[PDB]
Amino acid sequence: LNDYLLYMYNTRVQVNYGPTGEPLDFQIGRNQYDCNVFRADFATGTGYNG
């Protein structure tokens, strides 16, 4: 998903990267939606269903 929300074949939107180097650590788009929540976290289930 980090290689899908960043392969922009339309006009490129802005992106602010996070401090770490983990995947999905950025804020994408004009309204700067946080993308950190879609990483897997098995104690809460933060990205997937549930």
Partner: protein, 50 residues
């Protein structure tokens, strides 16, 4: 010319070479579509040649 060529990033898989070579100020982290990647992008040596 008046740019940041080399940027030292967080610890890399091989701990002896953890430098990032950015030719002409391009932080190439995402995948590249060759049509809409270089739109609206320039650097200091190329503007002072025009």
């Amino acid at each position: 010319w008046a740019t940041i060529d080399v940027e030292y990033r967080e610890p890399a898989p091989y701990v002896h070479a953890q430098r990032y070579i950015r030719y002409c100020g391009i932080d190439s982290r995402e995948l590249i579509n060759p049509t809409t990647y270089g739109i609206g992008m320039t650097y200091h040596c190329y503007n002072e040649m025009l």
